[PDB]
């Protein structure tokens, strides 16, 4: 079972699933072996009804697509569509939040409001929206309208690219024609250019994909911006993670998906309803998080994280999960079938994300509190039906200190230097206490024993004094293995890094260090790491491709994560990936993405299966950046 | 060779390609056999890096995707993305024309202008744009701005859906939530909902696809609208088709692709340059058409059609094609490799559609005449290099009467009834002279002997008095086999149909009938058949799913054609397809698309391999509609 997951709670539920005959993601993976080598290498195309076409990676025919498409065109077209799909997910999330903010300040959804007035005004300043003499509701309406305008062509490019990156970076991108004209405009243009008998030049195609990945960055950044306005900017919090946060005597309700627009309301209304749950025999309503919508309410409210990604079925296997409330993205559709065995009420809430066999509740922001009550009452009914039923909740959980928004990080640093908060961080980079910065991002993948790459790489970087920040299911992996617990700083961190975490924590009224890893939030909150790295770059007067900053999508899965990895390279970062993407069938495309993209953006993909080898390559990349600044290493 | 193409000129060039060792699309198809059965059935998914996943159509495992996706989810997701890709192609074409019209009336591209003032004003009326007291350039600017606004969400739905379909049809679509909110909005939403861990309900997924297909209809209709404003509404013309329109002593220049924005200019400037071509020893510049941009300038200017679709390489094999001028879509990238053997100068012109090994000329509307000259001079240089070289142009061509825009059809009918032009057509439907209407649309496909389905089905429908209209490469197939020559009416048409074609032609100052098939233009000009059928429906006071009107995408290939077939079903038409789409792996999805979609839109797909059987099923569908109106049959 430790070949499936390094998480001991997950291993325990795998034993239970095995003996109850419940099929899991790992079983479905095993039944799929051996996987198709054409798809694995990227040498398959189904973009027209003359296909499917394939190309032998080596040997005799087929050597070319029926229309004449070469291996390098087929590979670049397939990658481009996965970037566009990722952009469409992060774009759709941001768009829904834009409509919510607009409804809120137009008096149409009273359950929503401007919660962070500081954030609203700083965004409006960043966009060049006039604030002084304006009402908040009119500033916010201007911000929401500007958000919606970035989806289509207009007289400006996408402002959620051009106003978030260092001006030098924008000029480098603009010189290569890489600035997006509109978010949905770029998504559609990718789909057009990759359809049959259109773009057939690998380099032209990949430049389109880099541009589409910045459309995805815009959507990430807009989603983070709008969610902070509506629900508050995260600040440091303490909570717990892993399956042991479930409680047998409570109504256990998981929020699962990505968009917190309803899950933040569920959090609020669930407090309002403890009495109704006590009347059914529960201690209360135990809201817990799965995947990124769980990260959202962990970051803002300290909702304990139940589990993540590949292991999400295991929360049901406990027998104690009474409801699973879904919005969209990364939800294994298997949860709807598994619920018939485990008793869980699986509930979809979004018009464009339904699952056959789940109960659907048509959430509308105008009726959000009423919907949350209808939903939580289904959860209460479910808890009643398992009166007397035995549960197996693994008694396994970790302490999690989280909530490190970029504003929180700057604020924490300001306690060492009030008027120059970034300087203490840069000082310890220069003198070697901080070797560099590594962002862990992206999913788990069934192909990789769960969390194995994240923890192995992080363990080695931390001992080498790398400052480690994490998002999404990378934060999930680290948090479930103790990397967000300050009590483990002594074990995990080098002396230089420990010294810095201790000074910052001691200066923030804690008598203890910051945690070994800084949790910066959900996948769209990868935009927070951009805001931090960009601010560091602007303070040093250099572009991002000169900073000792790297990223590792160590176990990545989703098209969303492919987009993120690509815009990490596009904004200038050495970017490690721990699962082969479908590009090895084309050496020219692999060469572009792993080497020659350096000459365009200064970033590049680092393709490494072995996590120990990956850590060495990440340290080498961090150290080359150090040498380019003339730092010792 | 007749197993590859029923076109005798194509067969002759296949012999030449074979003996010169030049590989063709048919050779590349043969080298790809046997094709992958998982892809053929739709039972493959690569939407995340845990894949590729596949499902055995029958037998033991794998039975489900790794994430839990069922066969019906995987099949519906794959179809949805092909619809979105099609929508993005027709959308991009329309969008480029919208920007061109805006540049033209803003004084920025003097090579473009309002050429059809009648069309501009009728579109503006249809959209509710005020005309009286307004300048043309300000009406047109309003029309262009409204075109661009249909790509994103606004306070109205896509007007290029709601103002083009009968009001009853709009209410039926609106009741099922099928009206698009924005063209690129729907494309992105499809990409989101079909990414991993999102929509997992076949019916929900397919309803999204029907809505996205109407986004494609909007783009088709907008593209036709804008092209008519800019370049003129087609009116009946006489020309020729097939490889024999090439001339050994001329500079033979093919316009190839879909967007006529440059190819219409090439037509104009090529006249301006006969002397420069004569100075190099040519008789002149012989502009000919390939695929839909060729249809565009055939419809408006009588440019002879050289060839289409699957056979496009054959035009090069003659040795006489000096230049091939490409915009985008349906261009076999093989033309760039083949040119090294045949001497042809292959020229790309659009930023997002390049082909490795082709010469790229960066066309801009602001510099259109200068670009056309640079391009035509490359063609002249090429003609010089083949001085004395022998060519093999098959002496095979047909007479083509074309240009039947919906306005041209109404005008032609008006000569039988000035104030009620549709009535003569409806009269002969009622009394049986016209059994019904069949639209042939879409591509050729290497899987089907070229043109075999189109001609076989058309031959049987025409003898049964069906009025046949055609677009795209369906018009190409019919025109290259003599179906657009009035001299063949006696051979091809039933007595009822012949009587009507004769009366209309005789009443239009011809002493001869209309051609056996009415050529209504390019693939976006499928919107013209919609405008005609909608006008017929509005005149009878019924919805389109009550008219004896069918469609046949008899040899379809492109994702664009998948979108068209889907919106033909969505607007209510029985729609035959001649190549299996990747849906047979899911019986529930096949049942929805072939039967139960009837209960939503009244249209349905007719899946039939055998063209003789297809003609019977199309006649049966036409005759059931007749019976529903109480007509004899
Ligand atoms: S687009 Fe080309 S390579 Fe892809 S399926 Fe069609 S013929 Fe094959
Ligand atoms: S989305 Fe599901 S079915 Fe598709 S590749 Fe990923 S795991 Fe497999
Ligand atoms: S041949 Fe297996 S992915 Fe297409
Ligand atoms: S297994 Fe062949 S199309 Fe994927
Ligand atoms: Fe996740
Ligand atoms: Fe074509």
């Amino acid at each position: 079972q430790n070949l499936k997951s390094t998480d001991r709670a997950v291993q325990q539920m795998l034993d239970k699933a095995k003996r109850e005959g419940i099929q899991t993601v790992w079983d479905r993976y095993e039944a799929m072996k051996p996987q198709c080598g054409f798809g694995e290498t990227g040498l398959c195309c189904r973009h027209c009804l003359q296909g499917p076409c394939r190309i032998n990676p080596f040997g005799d025919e087929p050597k070319v697509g029926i229309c004449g498409a070469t291996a390098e065109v087929i590979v670049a077209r397939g990658l481009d569509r996965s970037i566009a799909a990722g952009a469409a997910g992060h774009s759709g999330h941001a768009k829904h939040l834009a409509h919510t903010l607009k409804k809120a300040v137009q008096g149409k959804a009273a359950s929503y409001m401007i919660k962070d007035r500081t954030k609203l005004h700083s965004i409006a300043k960043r966009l060049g929206i006039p604030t002084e003499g304006q009402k908040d509701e009119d500033i916010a309406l201007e911000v929401a309208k500007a958000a919606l305008a970035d989806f289509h062509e207009k007289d400006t490019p996408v402002l959620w690219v051009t106003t978030v990156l260092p001006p030098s970076r924008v000029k480098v991108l603009s010189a290569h024609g890489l600035i997006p004209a509109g978010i949905d405009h770029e998504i559609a243009e990718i789909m057009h250019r990759t359809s049959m008998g259109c773009d057939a030049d690998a380099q032209n195609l990949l430049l389109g994909g880099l541009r589409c990945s910045l459309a995805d960055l815009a959507g990430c950044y807009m989603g983070t911006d709008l969610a902070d306005i509506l629900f508050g900017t995260p600040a440091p919090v303490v909570t717990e993670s892993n399956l042991g946060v479930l409680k047998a005597d409570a109504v256990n309700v998981a929020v699962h998906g990505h968009n917190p627009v309803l899950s933040d309301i569920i959090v609020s209304v669930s407090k309002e309803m403890e009495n109704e749950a006590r009347a059914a025999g529960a201690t209360g309503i135990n809201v817990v998080g799965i995947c990124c919508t769980g990260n959202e309410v962990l970051m803002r409210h300290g909702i304990p994280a139940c589990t993540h990604s590949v292991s999400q079925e295991m929360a049901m296997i406990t027998g104690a999960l009474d409801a699973m409330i879904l919005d969209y993205q990364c939800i294994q559709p298997s949860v709807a079938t598994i619920a018939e065995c485990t008793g869980t009420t699986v509930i979809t809430t979004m018009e464009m994300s339904k699952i056959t066999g789940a109960t659907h509740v048509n959430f509308a922001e105008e009726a959000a509190v009423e919907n949350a009550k209808q939903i939580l009452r289904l959860a209460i009914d479910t808890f009643k039906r398992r009166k007397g039923k035995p549960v197996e909740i693994p008694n396994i959980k970790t302490k999690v200190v989280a909530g490190f928004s970029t504003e929180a990080i700057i604020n924490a640093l300001s306690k060492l230097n009030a008027n120059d908060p970034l300087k203490p961080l840069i000082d310890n980079v220069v003198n070697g206490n901080i070797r560099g910065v590594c962002l862990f991002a992206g999913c788990n993948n069934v192909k990789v024993p769960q969390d194995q790459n994240f923890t192995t790489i992080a363990r080695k970087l931390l001992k080498q004094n790398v400052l480690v920040v994490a998002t999404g299911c990378g934060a999930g992996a680290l948090m479930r293995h103790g990397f967000m617990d300050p009590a483990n700083v002594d074990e995990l961190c080098g002396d230089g890094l420990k010294a810095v975490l201790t000074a910052i924590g001691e200066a923030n009224g804690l008598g203890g260090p910051l945690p070994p890893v800084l949790h910066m939030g959900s996948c769209v909150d990868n935009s927070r790491a951009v805001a931090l790295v960009a601010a560091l770059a602007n303070r040093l007067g250099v572009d991002l491709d000169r900073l000792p900053v790297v990223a590792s999508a160590a176990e990545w899965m989703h098209e969303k994560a492919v987009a993120i990895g690509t815009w990490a390279v596009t904004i200038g970062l050495p970017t490690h990936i721990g699962v082969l993407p479908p590009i090895t069938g084309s050496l020219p495309v692999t060469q572009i993405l792993t080497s020659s993209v350096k000459d365009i953006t200064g970033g590049y993909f680092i393709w490494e299966l072995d996590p120990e080898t990956a850590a060495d390559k990440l340290l080498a990349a961090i150290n080359e950046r150090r040498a380019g600044l003339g730092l010792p290493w």
Side-chain angles (χ1 to χ4, degrees), chain A residues 277-499:
Chain A
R278 283 180 209 120
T283 47
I285 303 184
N286 188 40
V287 174
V288 303
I290 294 177
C291 267
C292 269
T293 204
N295 273 315
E296 297 284 359
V297 293
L298 185 139
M299 289 282 296
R300 301 203 172 74
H301 307 306
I303 298 299
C306 177
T307 188
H308 303 86
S309 202
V310 71
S311 61
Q312 61 185 266
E313 301 166 311
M314 294 308 103
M316 290 156 111
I317 303 297
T318 66
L321 193 67
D322 304 295
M324 176 180 283
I325 303 165
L326 317 167
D327 46 77
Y328 39 60
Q329 310 173 4
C330 309
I331 297 141
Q332 293 183 29
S334 67
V335 302
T337 291
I338 287 175
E340 305 174 47
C341 293
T342 70
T344 306
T345 300
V346 174
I347 290 158
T348 55
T349 65
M350 299 290 134
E351 197 50 38
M352 37 71 53
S353 196
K354 298 181 193 200
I355 308 182
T356 305
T359 303
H360 187 79
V361 166
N362 191 334
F363 155 94
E365 302 100 289
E366 305 96 335
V369 163
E370 145 199 357
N371 296 153
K373 274 179 280 151
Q374 174 179 14
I375 282 151
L376 290 173
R377 286 178 177 118
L378 294 175
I380 299 175
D381 292 358
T382 303
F383 168 91
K384 281 201 229 154
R385 298 201 282 271
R386 71 166 174 94
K387 176 151 165 273
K389 241 186 163 301
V391 303
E392 192 186 322
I393 299 174
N395 191 40
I396 295 177
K397 62 195 179 158
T398 61
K399 190 190 163 183
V400 174
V401 180
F404 295 105
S405 64
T406 295
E407 294 84 348
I409 294 180
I410 293 166
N411 176 248
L413 286 165
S414 73
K415 310 295 172 209
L416 298 173
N417 181 326
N419 303 323
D420 200 353
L422 294 177
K423 179 158 156 55
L425 182 38
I426 298 153
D427 281 340
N428 283 282
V429 172
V430 168
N431 66 26
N433 284 349
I434 303 293
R435 184 181 292 285
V437 176
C438 179
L439 160 67
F440 286 107
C443 341
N444 297 129
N445 188 313
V446 82
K447 294 168 168 180
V448 171
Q450 181 182 18
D451 311 327
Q452 180 173 273
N453 290 349
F454 286 120
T455 63
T456 297
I457 302 170
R459 270 184 218 281
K460 210 247 183 313
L461 299 187
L462 291 162
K463 279 268 173 250
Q464 279 296 279
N465 300 300
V466 176
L467 175 67
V468 176
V469 302
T471 58
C473 290
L478 293 182
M479 90 166 70
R480 280 179 291 94
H481 288 269
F483 290 76
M484 272 76 159
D485 184 350
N488 298 319
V489 165
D490 226 301
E491 195 197 316
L492 311 174
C493 310
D495 288 331
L497 169 66
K498 170 173 64 74

Side-chain angles (χ1 to χ4, degrees), chain A residues 48-114:
Chain A
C48 88
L49 298 183
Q50 294 183 319
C53 291
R54 71 200 183 283
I55 289 173
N56 289 318
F58 300 105
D60 302 329
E61 295 110 272
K63 291 155 107 47
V64 63
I66 288 169
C67 61
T70 60
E72 71 191 58
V73 164
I74 284 159
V75 163
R77 289 195 310 199
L79 175 73
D80 271 10
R81 285 186 174 191
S82 60
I83 296 168
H90 289 132
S91 130
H93 171 158
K95 183 189 287 181
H96 300 4
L97 285 173
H99 289 302
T100 303
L101 177 64
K102 192 158 135 231
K103 280 167 191 200
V105 301
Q106 273 175 3
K108 288 138 188 301
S111 294
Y112 302 86
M113 69 219 48
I114 301 166

Side-chain angles (χ1 to χ4, degrees), chain A residues 68 104 125 133 170 228 266 282 287 374 488 491 516 533 551 591 594 596 609 612:
Chain A
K125 185 61 150 239
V170 180
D228 285 359
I266 298 271
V287 174
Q374 174 179 14
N488 298 319
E491 195 197 316
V533 157
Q591 272 172 3
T594 56
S596 75
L609 286 204
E612 262 158 61

